[PDB]
Design a protein around this ligand. Sequence first.
Ligand SMILES: *CC(=O)CNC(=O)[C@H](CC(C)C)N[C@@H](c1ccc(-c2ccc(S(C)(=O)=O)cc2)cc1)C(F)(F)F
Ligand SMILES: *CC(=O)CNC(=O)[C@H](CC(C)C)N[C@@H](c1ccc(-c2ccc(S(C)(=O)=O)cc2)cc1)C(F)(F)F
Ligand SMILES: [Ca+2]
Ligand SMILES: [Ca+2]
Ligand SMILES: [Ca+2]
Ligand SMILES: [Ca+2]
Lengths: 215, 216
Amino acid sequence: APDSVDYRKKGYVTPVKNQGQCGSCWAFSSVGALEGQLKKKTGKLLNLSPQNLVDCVSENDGCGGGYMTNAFQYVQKNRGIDSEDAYPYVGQEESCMYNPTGKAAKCRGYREIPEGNEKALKRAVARVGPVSVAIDASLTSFQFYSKGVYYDESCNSDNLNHAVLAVGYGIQKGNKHWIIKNSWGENWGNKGYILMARNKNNACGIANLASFPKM
Amino acid sequence: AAPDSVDYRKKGYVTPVKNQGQCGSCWAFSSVGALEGQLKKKTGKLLNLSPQNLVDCVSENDGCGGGYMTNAFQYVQKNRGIDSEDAYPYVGQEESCMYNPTGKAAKCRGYREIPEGNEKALKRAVARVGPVSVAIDASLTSFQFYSKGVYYDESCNSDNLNHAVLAVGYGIQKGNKHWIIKNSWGENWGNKGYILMARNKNNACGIANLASFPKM
Ligand SMILES: *CC(=O)CNC(=O)[C@H](CC(C)C)N[C@@H](c1ccc(-c2ccc(S(C)(=O)=O)cc2)cc1)C(F)(F)F
Ligand SMILES: *CC(=O)CNC(=O)[C@H](CC(C)C)N[C@@H](c1ccc(-c2ccc(S(C)(=O)=O)cc2)cc1)C(F)(F)F
Ligand SMILES: [Ca+2]
Ligand SMILES: [Ca+2]
Ligand SMILES: [Ca+2]
Ligand SMILES: [Ca+2]
C-alpha cells in the first residue's frame, strides 16, 4: 500500500455535488464509490444517479436517510443503476422511475470494511478505489472546516450521521489524513473536500461503517 | 380476489411463539418465522430456524441492538443458508458468528416487498404466499398490555415503526377486520403470544409500511 494516494488525479472522481436539504448523503456516497469502480472497469468516468437510489432503494428512507450497503444491494438486485443524465437529481423523494435503457453501471455485491479498522480502509482506498464511509459530521468545526487536517475529540465515533467518500489519503506537514469528498456543494470546505485526520484512533468514526461495491 | 379470511396456523406453517427476552431481536424472530413458513410450504416440513444465527451474523443489522428483516433475508441469500434452531440455539445475547453450514436447514433466493402502505396488497400477499414479515408501532402501552380482541388505538403511529412481527393471516371478528399477528414476546403476552390488529383502518400502526417475505 502506497504512503499516499489520490484518485482525483487518476480521473476516478466526478465533480462535487450538492445534496441540498435532502438527507441523501448516503446516495451521493454510494454513487461516488460506484463511479470509481465503473471507471476502473470500463475506463469511463460519468455521473451516476443518486436520485435513482433515493427513489428506488426501498430498504432506505429517501430524504429521511439511509445506508450505503442497501444502495449497493439494490443496484445488484435491480441489475443496474441509471446515469445522472437519465435520472436527474431533484432533491426530494419521488416514485421509482428507473429506466433500463439509461443503465450505466452494474454491481455484483459489496464488501464491508471491518469496523474501526483504519488499516483496512487504507488498503481498500489504495487497491480498490474510492470507498463509501460514514462519519460524525455534527460538529460546528467540521461544518466550518476550511483547510488543514481536520481533527476534534468532540467527534463522536458512536454518533455516525453523515455519508461521504474517501477518494485518497496522505500526509500534509507530518499530519496523516483521509481525502474526503463531500456532497454539500463546491463551496463547502475546501472546494467541497475535507482532509480528515488519519490513524488518530478512528477519528469521527471514519472506519466504522465503510464499504464498497463489487463490479 | 383473495379469500375473506386466511389462517396459516391451520395449515401448519407456523412454529410456536418464542420469547426474544431482553435482546432487540424481534427482527430476527420475524425473519425466521417468514422463512419457516416458506420452508413448510415448499418442503412440507415445519421446523424452528435460528434467530441467533441472524443476530450473530447479520453484519448489516446491529445484533441485540436492533435491525431489519430485509437485511436478514439478504444475509441468508448471500450466506447460502440459515441454521436450524437446533444447530444454533437462541441465547438472548450477542455472540461471535458461529454459523455451521452442516446445520443449514433453509435457503433464500431473495425477498419481495409489499407495496408501502397498501393493506390490500398485504392481504393478497398473505393469501398467496403464507406468513409475511411486517413492522409495526408497538410502543403504545395499550399494545404492551394487550390481552384479546381486535386491537386498535387512534394514537398508534404509522411513521414510528419500532417492532417486528409476523402476519400469519387475517379475518374478521365481531365485525372488525383484522391481521393475525404472531409476536416474539412469549406465550404469556397477549392472546397466547398473538394479537389481532385492526385491518383496513387506514394502515393502523403502520402494519403495511414495511412488509416483506423471503423467496425460496
Ligand atoms: C446525510 C444525510 O443526508 C442523512 N444521513 C444518513 O442518511 C445517515 C448515513 C449513515 C451512513 C450514517 N443515516 C441515517 C439513517 C439511516 C437509516 C434510516 C432509515 C432506513 C430505513 C427505514 S425504513 C425500514 O422504515 O424504510 C427508516 C430509516 C434513516 C436514517 C442515520 F443513521 F440516522 F444517521
Ligand atoms: C424489536 C426489537 O426487538 C428491536 N426493534 C428493532 O430491531 C426494529 C425493528 C424494525 C422492523 C422497525 N428496528 C430498529 C433498529 C433498526 C436498525 C438498527 C441498526 C442497524 C444497523 C446499524 S449499523 C449501521 O451500525 O450497522 C445500526 C443500527 C437498529 C435498530 C428501529 F428502527 F430503531 F426501530
Ligand atoms: Ca417510505
Ligand atoms: Ca471541542
Ligand atoms: Ca456490521
Ligand atoms: Ca440491506
